[PDB]
Amino acid sequence: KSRVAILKANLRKSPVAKDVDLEFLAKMTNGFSGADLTEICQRACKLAIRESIESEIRRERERQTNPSAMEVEEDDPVPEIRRDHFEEAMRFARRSVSDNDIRKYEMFAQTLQQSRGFGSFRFPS
Amino acid sequence: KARGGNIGDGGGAADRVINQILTEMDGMSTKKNVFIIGATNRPDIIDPAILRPGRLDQLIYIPLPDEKSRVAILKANLRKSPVAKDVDLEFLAKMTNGFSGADLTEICQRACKLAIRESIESEIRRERQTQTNPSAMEVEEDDPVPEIRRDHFEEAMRFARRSVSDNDIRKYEMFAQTLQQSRGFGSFRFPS
Amino acid sequence: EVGYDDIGGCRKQLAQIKEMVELPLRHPALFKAIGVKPPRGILLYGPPGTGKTLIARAVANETGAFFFLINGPEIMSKLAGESESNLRKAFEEAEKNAPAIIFIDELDAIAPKREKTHGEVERRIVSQLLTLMDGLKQRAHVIVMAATNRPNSIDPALRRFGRFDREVDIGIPDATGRLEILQIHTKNMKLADDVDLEQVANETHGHVGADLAALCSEAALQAIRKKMDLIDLEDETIDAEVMNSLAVTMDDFRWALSQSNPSALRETVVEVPQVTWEDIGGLEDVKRELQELVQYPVEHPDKFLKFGMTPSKGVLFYGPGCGKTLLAKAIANECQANFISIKGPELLTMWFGESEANVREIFDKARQAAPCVLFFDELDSIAKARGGNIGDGGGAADRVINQILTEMDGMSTKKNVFIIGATNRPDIIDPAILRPGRLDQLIYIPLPDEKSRVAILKANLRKSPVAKDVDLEFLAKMTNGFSGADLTEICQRACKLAIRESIESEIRRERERQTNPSAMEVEEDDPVPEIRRDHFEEAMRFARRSVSDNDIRKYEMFAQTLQQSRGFGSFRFPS
Numbered sequence: 001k002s003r004v005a006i007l008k009a010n011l012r013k014s015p016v017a018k019d020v021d022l023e024f025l026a027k028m029t030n031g032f033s034g035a036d037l038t039e040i041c042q043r044a045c046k047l048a049i050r051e052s053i054e055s056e057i058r059r060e061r062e063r064q065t066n067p068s069a070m071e072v073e074e075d076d077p078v079p080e081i082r083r084d085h086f087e088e089a090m091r092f093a094r095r096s097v098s099d100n101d102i103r104k105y106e107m108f109a110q111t112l113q114q115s116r117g118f119g120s121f122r123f124p125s
Numbered sequence: 126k127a128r129g130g131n132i133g134d135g136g137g138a139a140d141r142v143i144n145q146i147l148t149e150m151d152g153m154s155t156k157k158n159v160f161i162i163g164a165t166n167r168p169d170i171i172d173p174a175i176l177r178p179g180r181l182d183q184l185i186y187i188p189l190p191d192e193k194s195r196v197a198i199l200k201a202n203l204r205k206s207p208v209a210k211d212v213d214l215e216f217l218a219k220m221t222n223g224f225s226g227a228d229l230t231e232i233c234q235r236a237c238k239l240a241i242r243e244s245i246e247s248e249i250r251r252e253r254q255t256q257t258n259p260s261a262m263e264v265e266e267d268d269p270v271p272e273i274r275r276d277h278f279e280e281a282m283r284f285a286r287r288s289v290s291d292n293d294i295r296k297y298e299m300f301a302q303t304l305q306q307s308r309g310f311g312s313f314r315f316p317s
Numbered sequence: 318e319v320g321y322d323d324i325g326g327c328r329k330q331l332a333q334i335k336e337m338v339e340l341p342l343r344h345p346a347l348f349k350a351i352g353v354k355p356p357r358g359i360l361l362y363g364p365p366g367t368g369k370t371l372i373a374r375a376v377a378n379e380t381g382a383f384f385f386l387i388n389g390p391e392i393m394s395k396l397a398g399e400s401e402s403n404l405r406k407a408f409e410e411a412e413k414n415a416p417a418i419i420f421i422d423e424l425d426a427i428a429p430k431r432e433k434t435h436g437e438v439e440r441r442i443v444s445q446l447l448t449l450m451d452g453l454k455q456r457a458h459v460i461v462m463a464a465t466n467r468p469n470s471i472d473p474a475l476r477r478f479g480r481f482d483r484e485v486d487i488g489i490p491d492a493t494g495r496l497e498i499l500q501i502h503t504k505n506m507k508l509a510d511d512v513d514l515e516q517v518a519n520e521t522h523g524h525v526g527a528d529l530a531a532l533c534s535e536a537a538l539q540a541i542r543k544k545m546d547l548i549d550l551e552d553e554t555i556d557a558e559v560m561n562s563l564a565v566t567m568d569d570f571r572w573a574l575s576q577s578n579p580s581a582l583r584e585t586v587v588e589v590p591q592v593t594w595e596d597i598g599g600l601e602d603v604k605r606e607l608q609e610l611v612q613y614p615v616e617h618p619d620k621f622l623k624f625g626m627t628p629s630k631g632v633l634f635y636g637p638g639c640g641k642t643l644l645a646k647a648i649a650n651e652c653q654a655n656f657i658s659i660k661g662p663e664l665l666t667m668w669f670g671e672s673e674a675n676v677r678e679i680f681d682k683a684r685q686a687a688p689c690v691l692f693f694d695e696l697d698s699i700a701k702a703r704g705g706n707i708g709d710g711g712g713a714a715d716r717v718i719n720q721i722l723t724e725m726d727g728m729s730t731k732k733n734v735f736i737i738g739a740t741n742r743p744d745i746i747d748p749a750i751l752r753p754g755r756l757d758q759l760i761y762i763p764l765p766d767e768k769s770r771v772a773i774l775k776a777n778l779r780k781s782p783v784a785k786d787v788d789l790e791f792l793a794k795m796t797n798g799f800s801g802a803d804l805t806e807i808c809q810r811a812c813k814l815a816i817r818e819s820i821e822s823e824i825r826r827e828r829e830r831q832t833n834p835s836a837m838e839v840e841e842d843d844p845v846p847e848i849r850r851d852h853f854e855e856a857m858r859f860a861r862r863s864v865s866d867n868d869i870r871k872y873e874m875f876a877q878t879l880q881q882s883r884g885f886g887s888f889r890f891p892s
């Protein structure tokens with residue numbers, strides 16, 4: 001749930017198509033940190049931007065050769081981050097936090113734990 | 126432990142006896158009846174091959190006895206000895222915050238020893254009294270200490286000690302959480 | 318009488334013996350007009366109780382040769398100075414009934430001298446037997462077959478040319494042969510319909526033909542004890558119909574198997590693995606490479622000979638529970654070649670005991686059972702035992718690996734034995750192992766993929782009753798980096814949870830009838846007949862990744878430590 005919330009927060013500004021199931025992406029990210037999810041979202045946005053710039057440019061380059069040649073239709077080749085962009089991003093998905101240093105954090109949390117044997121403590125009735 | 130434990134020998138954990146035990150276990154299971162149980166106070170130094178599947182894989186952690194467990198241990202240790210109903214055992218078990226089974230056994234043994242010494246000394250003196258002053262009518266009052274009393278247990282507990290320090294319990298807790306079932310599947314649900 | 322039908326086990330050395338002995342015996346007149354030397358002696362060796370004497374008797378009966386049996390201790394038990402007369406008379410009598418077969422059972426008693434050769438009279442017996450055996454004037458067709466537990470137990474001069482020049486290792490029967498032995502030993506007891514002899518055969522690993530017969534007899538005796546004793550109606554001869562009314566039930570066979578104590582479980586097994594490529598879900602590049610290296614030289618030896626290329630006879634699997642042993646078994650199964658597995662405990666035992674001559678014996682055994690896939694599982698065990706980070710002061714060379722290298726260098730002659738090595742620590746493996754002529758073809762086994770994980774889960778859960786509701790593809794995909802061992806553990810835990818729930822539930826339900834006896838008995842069957850979604854969810858709750866990503870990183874390093882350079886990728890010839 002925290003991963004889903006982080007993904008939603010990162011992608012709020014970016015225009016994301018409703019077809020992309022963000023919950024599936026969050027659940028597939030087994031142990032990604034918030035930084036890793038932000039990196040994945042940034043990579044997806046970068047992929048979308050590169051595709052949009054290349055497609056609009058290559059269309060304009062061909063169109064500019066003949067003056068007024070093709071129709072004046074106002075096409076948006078990529079108007080939202082698509083699913084393929086999210087697969088493109090996940091291909092480079094990385095686990096920043098190794099399980100050994102998570103082991104160390106849980107170790108320090110255990111050492112900070114309130115010892116043992118006082119759970120059943122009860123005042124005499 | 127014999128080969129070390131902190132630095133040890135230059136070689137790994139493998140040794141002749143454990144290797145033979147592994148070979149016998151691998152060649153075992155045919156009998157369908159023998160069941161191997163292993164106990165170790167130093168799980169960190171145990172050979173990892175011992176824990177592979179087909180070997181002693183099911184690791185079970187035995188923690189220090191709880192208050193109720195301590196009461197049961199005290200009762201078992203004192204079942205044979207004559208213990209006066211006055212001495213409350215639940216209070217003694219609860220008082221022992223972290224005593225191990227061995228520590229409780231030592232406390233019970235020390236209490237029994239104190240009672241035995243007191244009884245021997247008392248009847249010995251009482252025998253002097255008849256030898257020194259022969260009474261006209263023989264009337265034995267029986268045993269001056271027929272069962273273990275509160276004072277014996279208090280004196281014994283005076284010498285009670287915790288054999289197991291909290292640092293070695295911390296290492297065991299570490300290994301236990303070193304067999305940690307991950308941290309991402311706790312909510313695994315099938316798609317429906 | 319006894320024949321090929323009686324000879325069970327289908328161990329495929331009886332066929333070799335047949336091919337050996339028909340023409341010398343089945344067509345004796347043929348050798349009279351053709352100048353050829355037949356097999357003067359055949360040494361059948363193997364664990365006791367494997368039917369060597371039975372095989373010899375069956376061959377003698379099926380070929381018509383006069384069978385003569387010279388029991389080892391029968392002659393040895395005779396008085397000194399007249400036992401030699403017994404041996405000489407036995408050979409003369411066998412000579413008279415040409416063609417004849419002389420079988421020497423327990424040959425390791427007449428000529429046990431392994432150059433130690435204690436005593437005086439036994440030296441006379443061995444020397445005279447040698448004179449007789451070498452004294453065969455190639456006239457007539459007497460074939461001398463002898464039985465011995467191991468080839469090295471008998472006097473070496475008996476192993477020399479012309480005395481016993483060819484040897485056959487009958488060996489322990491396999492599951493298929495154990496089943497056929499059970500069938501032959503269970504043919505007049507009117508076996509019950511419930512008992513199939515297939516489950517017993519699979520659970521009968523470690524038994525020999527004598528062991529199988531003893532187990533069958535014990536099951537029959539249990540059946541006789543359970544019934545027909547309560548009635549206690551007995552006479553001089555039990556009625557045939559009354560005895561036939563009983564049927565040996567599966568329970569009796571199960572108890573007998575529990576009370577078996579097989580007479581040589583420890584003996585090494587030479588068996589065609591039953592594992593198949595189906596058990597492993599993937600490794601297509603690895604599967605094809607293994608198929609190439611092993612299968613191609615034999616399936617198409619002519620094409621290998623045409624290009625003048627000698628195929629590599631060694632492959633070293635390296636990887637993190639990923640199925641290397643299973644892959645080796647599968648490759649052996651595809652080629653239908655015998656599989657010999659040398660696990661790490663055996664190597665460690667040879668190293669600790671300073672007994673590396675066992676490597677010579679292991680290689681000889683692999684050579685005899687050709688085609689074979691000699692697999693050295695977890696070959697890095699000795700290096701780990703000596704260290705790995707600092708280790709001993711010396712280098713990677715050790716006694717056991719050196720002996721293995723010597724045997725491999727002296728190998729390749731056989732053209733059939735194929736060495737497969739598996740190691741989880743490629744960094745510490747001795748470099749000499751990877752030199753040409755050794756296990757040079759390094760194959761990396763990676764963690765199973767999603768599809769591979771699905772296949773592994775299916776293979777682990779094939780036997781267990783799994784409800785169709787529980788989706789397996791979802792579980793495999795959910796396990797991002799679980800190893801084959803981890804998936805097996807998850808499946809085992811799910812099965813354990815289901816078993817505990819079923820036991821607890823039926824136990825309570827039985828209290829329920831005992832506490833409140835119902836007027837009409839109507840069992841609702843099993844409350845949990847198959848493994849459900851909740852069992853798998855609880856089991857996965859405890860799922861764990863045994864293999865950390867750092868050790869996978871080290872394996873990736875070594876893999877790219879076998880990097881094909883970085884400048885030739887575009888090599889083009891000048892044209």
Ligand SMILES: Cc1cc(OCc2nnc(SC3CCCC3)n2-c2cccnc2)ccc1-c1ccc(S(C)(=O)=O)cc1
Pocket residue numbers: 157158159160780781
């Ligand atoms: C049925 C079975 C019983 C068994 O053995 C039971 C047993 N008896 N005495 C003992 S020992 C004694 C008990 C107290 C002290 C020790 N055991 C035993 C076995 C294992 C662990 N503890 C005890 C093994 C294995 C099996 C089977 C499981 C699956 C399949 S299939 C092809 O997938 O359908 C085939 C066969």
Ligand SMILES: Cc1cc(OCc2nnc(SC3CCCC3)n2-c2cccnc2)ccc1-c1ccc(S(C)(=O)=O)cc1
Pocket residue numbers: 610611612614615618619621622623624625626627628629630652654688689690732733734735
């Ligand atoms: C023709 C040939 C066959 C061979 O052997 C084939 C073989 N048979 N059974 C087996 S074993 C069994 C198979 C499955 C499990 C193991 N093999 C075998 C050989 C190598 C690797 N794997 C198997 C060797 C070497 C040669 C040759 C190559 C070049 C030349 S020239 C002078 O340059 O023109 C001369 C000779």
Ligand SMILES: Nc1ncnc2c1ncn2[C@@H]1O[C@H](COP(=O)(O)OP(=O)(O)O)[C@@H](O)[C@H]1O
Pocket residue numbers: 323324325326364365366367368369370371372422464498501502525526527530
């Ligand atoms: N494959 C088999 N088929 C039928 N009987 C067998 C088989 N294998 C072993 N036996 C039993 O083994 C018994 C004795 O074993 P034997 O043939 O003398 O071998 P060995 O001399 O090595 O001990 C025989 O009485 C026979 O019943």
